[PDB]
Each structure stands twice: as C-alpha cells, then as structure tokens.
Design an enzyme around this catalytic site. Structure first.
Site, short mmCIF file in Angstrom:
data_model
loop_
_atom_site.label_atom_id
_atom_site.label_comp_id
_atom_site.label_asym_id
_atom_site.label_seq_id
_atom_site.Cartn_x
_atom_site.Cartn_y
_atom_site.Cartn_z
N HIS A 110 -7.36 0.86 2.40
CA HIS A 110 -6.65 -0.36 2.75
C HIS A 110 -5.38 -0.26 3.59
O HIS A 110 -5.04 -1.22 4.29
CB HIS A 110 -6.34 -1.16 1.48
CG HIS A 110 -6.98 -2.51 1.46
ND1 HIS A 110 -6.67 -3.49 2.38
CD2 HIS A 110 -7.93 -3.04 0.66
CE1 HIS A 110 -7.41 -4.56 2.15
NE2 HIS A 110 -8.19 -4.31 1.11
N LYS A 142 -25.11 -20.83 0.77
CA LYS A 142 -24.31 -21.80 1.50
C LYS A 142 -25.08 -23.11 1.69
O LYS A 142 -24.48 -24.18 1.82
CB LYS A 142 -23.91 -21.23 2.86
CG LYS A 142 -22.87 -20.14 2.77
CD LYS A 142 -22.33 -19.74 4.15
CE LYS A 142 -23.29 -18.85 4.90
NZ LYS A 142 -22.61 -18.29 6.09
N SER A 162 -11.80 -12.14 -3.04
CA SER A 162 -11.91 -12.14 -1.60
C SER A 162 -13.36 -12.35 -1.22
O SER A 162 -14.28 -11.87 -1.90
CB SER A 162 -11.38 -10.84 -1.00
OG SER A 162 -12.21 -9.75 -1.31
N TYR A 176 0.74 -1.26 0.00
CA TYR A 176 0.00 0.00 0.00
C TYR A 176 0.78 1.33 0.00
O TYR A 176 0.68 2.12 -0.95
CB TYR A 176 -0.97 -0.02 1.18
CG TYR A 176 -1.84 -1.26 1.23
CD1 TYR A 176 -1.80 -2.12 2.33
CD2 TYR A 176 -2.71 -1.57 0.19
CE1 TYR A 176 -2.60 -3.26 2.39
CE2 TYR A 176 -3.52 -2.71 0.24
CZ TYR A 176 -3.46 -3.55 1.34
OH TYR A 176 -4.25 -4.67 1.39
N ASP A 181 -17.11 -21.60 0.25
CA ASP A 181 -16.07 -20.74 -0.31
C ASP A 181 -15.27 -21.53 -1.34
O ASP A 181 -15.11 -21.10 -2.49
CB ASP A 181 -15.14 -20.23 0.80
CG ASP A 181 -14.12 -19.24 0.29
OD1 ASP A 181 -14.51 -18.11 -0.06
OD2 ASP A 181 -12.93 -19.61 0.22
N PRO A 215 -11.46 -0.74 -0.80
CA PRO A 215 -12.64 -1.54 -1.14
C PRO A 215 -13.92 -0.74 -0.98
O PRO A 215 -14.01 0.15 -0.13
CB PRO A 215 -12.57 -2.70 -0.16
CG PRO A 215 -11.12 -2.84 0.11
CD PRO A 215 -10.70 -1.40 0.27
C1 LIG Z 1 -8.74 -6.93 -2.94
N1 LIG Z 1 -7.41 -7.46 -2.67
C2 LIG Z 1 -7.45 -8.92 -2.73
C3 LIG Z 1 -6.49 -6.97 -3.69
C4 LIG Z 1 -6.95 -7.01 -1.36
C5 LIG Z 1 -7.64 -7.81 -0.23
O1 LIG Z 1 -8.95 -7.26 0.02
C6 LIG Z 1 -6.80 -7.69 1.04
C7 LIG Z 1 -5.57 -8.61 1.02
O2 LIG Z 1 -5.65 -9.69 0.40
O3 LIG Z 1 -4.54 -8.25 1.61
#
Ligand SMILES: C[N+](C)(C)C[C@H](O)CC(=O)O
Length: 599
Positions: free
Chosen positions: A317, A393, A528, A81, A404, A94
């Site tokens: 994030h 589910k 995710s 990040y 999942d 997100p």
């Molecule tokens: C969306 N993505 C998978 C890139 C980030 C995830 O939400 C968080 C992570 O996997 O660290």
C-alpha cells in the site's frame, strides 16, 4: 500521463472549518451516546470560535496548500503507511485473487506466468510513453500520478518509519523483474538491447532456466523476513544488507519492475474452503511451509501464479492505490487472452542471474523469528469468501439505485442485525479528481442508515415506511460518496488540522483527545469496492482487533465478497457476518420489489 492533463487538475482543497465540523457531528450521532455527542458538540464550537485554535490551524492548512502540490500527500503517505509499524502482510497490503487458469501441469504454469509478464510489460509501455488513455469522471480530469508509482518501486524499512523508492523514471530505469521459485530469487531481464521487450516465448524459456536453477526448496526463505513487524524487520533488514552479496541481491529486488512468484504445490483441501485458502495464499501465502517464504512483501507489485491454476496478486500500500491496480488487472487479464503471433525466431538468451543470500546465525535467527510471527498472524486471521450469485449491479440499477450505496447500506443492515447497534464504518473514496489525490473517507454509518436498520427490524414500522427509509438510506450514502469525491468529505481534513497542530508544536486540541474522536476513528468495519471488469476480488485484514475487513467487486449478475476478522476477538466471526450480509442483500431486494413506486 500528459503534462497538459495533470496541469489542468484542480489542487486538493481545504474545506471550510464549519462545513467539516458540521459533517463531523452528523456522522458521530449514529455511533456515540448523547452525552458524548453533546460534549463533542461543545468542543466543536470552542474549536471554531472566533480567533480560536481551529482558525489558526485552518489557516495553517490553507497556507500549506499554497506552498505544496497537495497539502495532504506527504502527510497521508506518512501517517497511514510509512509510520504504521504493523507487518504489511494482512494488515496493510491488499490481496487479490484473479480468475483461475486452466493449466494442469508445470509447463502450463510457466506458460501462463510468461503471458502475464508480457501483459504487464505491454501495460508498462503505455505508462512509459505516456500513451495510457487519460481518464475522466463526469467530464472532470482524473489525476494519473498513481500509475507511475506501482512499477519499479519498493518499500524500504526504516528504524523509525519506512520510505518508498521509485525508479520508473530515473536515468537508467530498470529493465529486469524479479522471479522467485522455491524461495530463491532471480534477476530476469525482460527487454532486449534495442528496447523491444521479450516475447511470451522468450520469457517462458527464461522462466524455465530459473525453474531448473532451483529444483529444490533447499535454501533459506530470506524473503519471509519482509512479513514481520516493521520494527523487527527494519533491524533484521539492516543486519541483512551488511553483506555485499545480500545487499546486491536486495538492491536488485528493489529496482525490479515487479516480482512474480511461482508457488509450489500445497496440500488439498475440501472444496467448501478452497476459495478461502486461495485467498490466504494471495493475501499472506499460507505460512512457513507453504508459499510465504516465496515472497518479498516490501515489493510494490507481486503477481502470484499457483501450482493448481489459481493466481492473484498482492500489492504494498505505501506506493500503491486501488485504481492503478484495477486498471492493470483488467488490461493484463484481457491481454493474456489475445491470440499471440508467430514465434519470433529464437535468438541467444542469457542465464537469469540468481540473487544469492549469505546466511549467518543472526540472519537465520531472524528468519525463524519471522516464521513464528507470521504463523501466529495466519492462525489469527478469519476469512470467508462469499460469492453472491443472487444478483449484482443489475438489480440495484433496475431500481434506479447506486449498487455501491446499496451494498454499503446492506452491510449496515447486516451489522445491526448481529450487534444491535451501528458502528464507525469506513469506505474508501477516490480523491483522484485532484492532483496527487489518493483517498478520503465515506462514512457508511449515518443518521439515515441507522434509521433504516432500526425501522427495518421494528415490527411497528410499516413495510411501506421501511422501503422509504431504505431509499433514503441509499441516497444519503450516494450523496456522501459524491461529496467525498469532490473533496467535501471531512476525515482527511480533520487529520490535517491535527497534523498541522503537531507540526506547529501547539498543545494537542481537545477535539482530538475526545472519546468521540477515538470512536469515530476506530473502524469496526473497514471497506472498499474494487470496480473491476475482471471477475476478481480483493481482501485485507480488519483495521481493528474487534473489526472486519470487507471488500467487494460488483459484477453484472453477482457480487464477489471477501470478509475478514480476527480470532483473537470472540465477538467477531467471518462466516456469520457473510451469512447475514447475504440475507440483508436479499431482504432489501424483496422489500424493494414488493413496494414499487407507481405505474
Ligand atoms: C483497506 N483500507 C480501506 C484500509 C485501505 C484502502 O484500500 C485504501 C484507502 O482507503 O486509502
């Protein structure tokens, strides 16, 4: 939370070199050519040869883990990040869409917005007091450190790499939040003199003053600057706080417990694209004319309350991970339903401080540049929100299968059906069983999954054999999921060896410059799950130009999906992928039910 709890957590481990390199080769097989696999096979050996480079790096990681709470913490935060210079909007933060509300007028909008703020503060009291129920999985403690990062924090631009500030536990922790309406920010205190927090009613009154103190969208959308390229934003940011008032306003936002966005009315759109747009509003805001200027994207938590009843949020994030958000969401949404109490006699309430922004020709030019940049971004984002009503589910679970794993395997079936080959796939795995653990990678593209997708479409392979390939593919995935959760995955570990090498100023190892590693880290499918009790869904942009962003929340009898892609790539289309994904989920059920075990 509890000190004793966190003290009992095992610290993130360093997996054995041979283990991680073996898993690495297995995960490459379905996505690279044999030549590329053979060569990577040779490079893998040389890397782990006796007394070789791999060993020195490996031991470096082991030493590193002895002298740090988490050998990967600073490194992950930094490379994923703080060093990512793409705009955080769409590419990193997100977007979340919560269940629509029923308010039909402005007052209803301020009322809900008020209930929600009180909801988050109730959630905050638990975090401050450390009374938030300690969590577990299977009987293993789960790190609670992520709950302390999401509140009262903010990302800070940097000419080279950003950073994250957190004031939750400082000497004078924040007691105010930031509310933004019609592009103008305000500083609202949400606590009284005696610590007690304002009530849903005391909040609504304050929000009303704010609403009034910004009747028109007659101000510059300073906040939209936070959505430009991180390098561009760092310069404009620095130039922005050269002013005393600007700096003071910015500073107030950075410390605010969190931000709440009271969006303005937007044009109407055909129903079949309504959810898609709402997501867009939560993810990016819709653009310069809509609500994009009604945001401060550096803010860790941004709760959005739409004018038409919709609502959702968007988190940065850097300091926010999934788990905390999900917990906060469930707890807040539920709280906004709990019947209130008799109106606490009203006491004198102050006027929420307006955070003014002195505009200069340069600040104004950056804003125009930010509008233009964001506009391009939005025009390139292709989103399709799919509500899978067929089942959730319940079906997978009635088949004794992880939902999942099932969904992930369906996605593999869908991709292959469209492109005729598998691709590097990523699925977030929670490393919370370890102190300060964030995430690790579960690779959905596996030997067993490809075997399943090929066979699935092979006219020669018998249905019965297809169903067995399916069961193997699901189980393989679940195992990998459990492994990644216990720290037996390999992606973070590979990243660590590479970073360790850089840090020690050693020539970049061959294993990393290898074409196979480039392919293995180029995620055409980024995924995710959002395991929330609330009927909500998340979304985010693809991590690669020619890739997709897929996020889902499995509910009992249905599944909420978000599928994103970029228009700049003609080979990828959101609708089509969503369309195939549905068909894949259904063919899997049909196949499973027509070939049961025994009686
Ligand atoms: C969306 N993505 C998978 C890139 C980030 C995830 O939400 C968080 C992570 O996997 O660290």
């Amino acid at each position: 939370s509890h000190m004793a709890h966190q003290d009992a957590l095992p610290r993130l481990p360093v997996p054995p070199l041979q283990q991680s390199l073996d898993y690495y080769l297995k995960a490459l097989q379905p996505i690279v050519s044999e030549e590329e696999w053979a060569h990577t096979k040779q490079l893998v050996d040389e890397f782990q040869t006796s007394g070789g480079v791999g060993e020195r790096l490996q031991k470096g990681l082991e030493r590193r883990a002895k002298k740090m709470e988490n050998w990967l913490s600073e490194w992950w935060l930094k490379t994923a990040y703080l060093q990512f210079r793409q705009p955080v909007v769409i590419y990193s933060s997100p977007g979340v869409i919560l269940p629509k509300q029923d308010f039909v007028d402005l007052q209803g909008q301020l009322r809900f917005a008020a209930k929600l703020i009180e909801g988050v503060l109730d959630f905050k009291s638990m975090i401050d007091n450390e009374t938030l129920p300690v969590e577990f999985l299977g009987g293993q403690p789960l790190c609670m450190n992520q709950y302390y990062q999401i509140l009262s924090s903010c990302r800070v631009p940097g000419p080279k790499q950003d950073s994250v500030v957190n004031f939750l536990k400082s000497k004078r922790p924040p007691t105010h939040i930031t509310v933004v309406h019609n592009y103008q920010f305000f500083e609202l205190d949400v606590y009284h003199s005696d610590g007690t927090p304002l009530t849903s009613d005391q909040i609504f009154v304050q929000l009303e003053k704010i609403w009034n103190s910004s009747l028109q969208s007659n101000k510059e959308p300073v906040g939209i600057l936070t959505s430009n390229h991180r390098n561009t934003w760092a310069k404009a940011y620095n130039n922005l706080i050269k002013d005393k008032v600007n700096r003071e306003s910015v500073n107030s936002i950075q410390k605010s417990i969190f931000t709440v966005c009271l969006d303005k009315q937007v044009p109407r759109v055909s129903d079949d694209v309504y959810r898609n747009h709402v997501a867009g509003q939560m993810l990016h805001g819709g653009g310069s004319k809509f609500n994009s200027g009604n945001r401060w994207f550096d803010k860790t938590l941004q709760f959005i309350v739409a004018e038409d009843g919709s609502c959702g949020m968007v988190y940065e994030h850097a300091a926010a991970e999934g788990p905390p958000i999900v917990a906060l969401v469930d707890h807040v949404m539920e709280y906004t339903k709990k019947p209130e109490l008799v109106r606490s006699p009203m006491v004198p309430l102050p006027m929420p401080k307006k955070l003014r922004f002195n505009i200069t020709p340069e600040i104004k030019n950056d804003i125009e540049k930010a509008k233009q940049n964001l506009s391009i971004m939005i025009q390139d984002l292709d989103i399709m929100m799919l509500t899978f009503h067929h089942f959730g589910k319940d079906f997978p679970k009635s088949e004794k299968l992880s939902p999942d794993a099932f969904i992930q395997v369906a996605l593999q079936l869908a991709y292959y059906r469209i492109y005729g080959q598998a691709c590097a796939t990523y699925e977030s795995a929670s490393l919370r069983m370890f102190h300060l653990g964030r995430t690790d990678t579960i690779r959905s593209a596996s030997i067993d999954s490809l075997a399943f997708v090929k066979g699935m479409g092979d006219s020669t392979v018998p249905e019965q054999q297809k169903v067995e390939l399916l069961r193997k593919a699901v189980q393989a995935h679940r195992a990998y999921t459990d492994r990644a959760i216990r720290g037996e995955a390999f992606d973070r570990h590979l990243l660590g060896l590479k970073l360790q090498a850089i840090e020690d100023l050693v020539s970049m190892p061959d294993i990393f410059m290898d074409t196979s590693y480039a392919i293995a880290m180029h995620f055409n499918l980024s995924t995710s799950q959002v395991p929330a009790k609330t009927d909500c869904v998340g979304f985010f942009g693809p991590v690669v130009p020619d890739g997709y962003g897929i996020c889902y929340n499995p509910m009992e009898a249905h599944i909420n999906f978000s599928v994103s892609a970029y228009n700049s790539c003609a080979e990828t289309n959101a609708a089509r992928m969503a369309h195939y994904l549905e068909k894949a989920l259904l063919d899997m059920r049909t196949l499973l039910q027509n070939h049961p075990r025994a009686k």
